[PDB]
Amino acid sequence: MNPPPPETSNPNKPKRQTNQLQYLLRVVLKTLWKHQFAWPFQQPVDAVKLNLPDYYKIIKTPMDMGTIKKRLENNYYWNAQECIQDFNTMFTNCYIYNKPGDDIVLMAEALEKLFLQKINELPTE
Numbered sequence: 001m002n003p004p005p006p007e008t009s010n011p012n013k014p015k016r017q018t019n020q021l022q023y024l025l026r027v028v029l030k031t032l033w034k035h036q037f038a039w040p041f042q043q044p045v046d047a048v049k050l051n052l053p054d055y056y057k058i059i060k061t062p063m064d065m066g067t068i069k070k071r072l073e074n075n076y077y078w079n080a081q082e083c084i085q086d087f088n089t090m091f092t093n094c095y096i097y098n099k100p101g102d103d104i105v106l107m108a109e110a111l112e113k114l115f116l117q118k119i120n121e122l123p124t125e
């Protein structure tokens with residue numbers, strides 16, 4: 001069974017736009033999105049579709065790039081570090097749910113390297 005997907009809006013939570021968050025959407029996310037290994041990560045894991053009935057028994061903080069994209073588009077985040085944390089959660093979830101050497105892990109490893117390359121230098125305020 002699937003839990004509800006992570007929120008992409010929250011009226012109690014303050015919004016912010018920064019040069020770094022704009023870059024995270026326009027450059028980092030939109031470039032990673034086009035990578036040949038991005039497709040498993042473009043939407044929340046559908047455990048019913050994918051026949052992964054234990055996915056959410058293992059992964060308690062799910063995250064994916066579709067959620068991140070909507071959060072960025074909604075100015076959901078306070079700062080770039082909060083968004084970067086969601087990317088890191090997405091990658092770590094992949095390593096937790098699977099095991100070294102799996103195809104999906106090789107995909108996450110490649111995307112993580114590209115992500116780090118792109119966030120190594122961010123714009124300034």
Ligand SMILES: Nc1ccc2ncc(Br)n2c1
Pocket residue numbers: 039040041045050094097098104
């Ligand atoms: N679409 C996805 C996303 C993440 C993930 N971890 C293991 C499998 Br199979 N996964 C499939």
Ligand SMILES: Nc1ccc2ncc(Br)n2c1
Pocket residue numbers: 040050103104107
């Ligand atoms: N064994 C599986 C099942 C689903 C799936 N989506 C991406 C990868 Br890599 N996947 C591997």
